[PDB]
Amino acid sequence: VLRSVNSREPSQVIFCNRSPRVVLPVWLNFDGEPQPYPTLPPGTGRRIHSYRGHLWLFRDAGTHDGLLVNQTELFVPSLNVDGQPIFANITLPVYTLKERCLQVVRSLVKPENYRRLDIVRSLYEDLEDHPNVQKDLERLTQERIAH
Template sequence: MPEDVSGRPGEAAPLGPLRSHDSCEPSYVTFCNCTGRSVKPVWINYRGEPVPYSTMAAQSGRRMTTYFGHPWMFRDAVSDDRLLVNGHEVFVPPTGQVNEIGQPCYIMVKITIPVYTLKERCLQVVRSLVKREDYRNLEIVGSLYDELEDQPQILKDLERIQKQLAEREETLADRESP
């Protein structure tokens, strides 16, 4: 069960389509950090808000019992850069399975580093080497100052994904209407 039970259904209007749904169906997963980075697992609660879990060390794994329909995202614990889970930005667990003697069958969920654009990767490196207050002292093109200062944040990525999902739902609804 998620660590923070705030955001139960009925407490507030959902922020968007990406949120946990009430489910009693457990899902048995092993989150495998296949990166050389410390990783922050993040559960998306019933209101569509991120709830961070304890950090996973590089090249480690964590068995979890979560629930069908409870989305997860993963972030670099230091930089908050987005990471991928089974090749996607969001993982939504399937219904869990048990073997013939009733023991949970854990599925492996791989956390990996995406192929960042060259620009994204360069911004990451500069952020890791230069203090934020010194960005404007760098001899670089002016437009990069703002991009350096625009640090990665899960809330921005979550908002972008929520918008994409809402647009997709709207497009599907338009196709179905006469």
């Protein structure tokens, strides 16, 4: 359901990293599986070859924190018009403070050590619940069934 269609119709795209994170572009293949592509440093952008009807999302390539693209979770190339490439503007989201506080602690603390923090067991599990695309892909499949 959440997967690239094999249209074989080429599309020129500009992956524009407008975040301070090193970004990992992630192509959803024809069976819905996530393929890592080469990383974009912050404040860079790149003309790249994709296809119509394909699916992308983008992540911190170092921690797998999720990022927005053109204000949303998924990016889908269409046909170029009048010789114009299509822009995928990789943006940070407004993380919740909690989510951000987890990002920061995660990056300061080796996971073999989360439990030597003096905090409720609740937060240990929030810490350990590292972000991954598959969890998000699942969550996003389901909101589209409400929508």
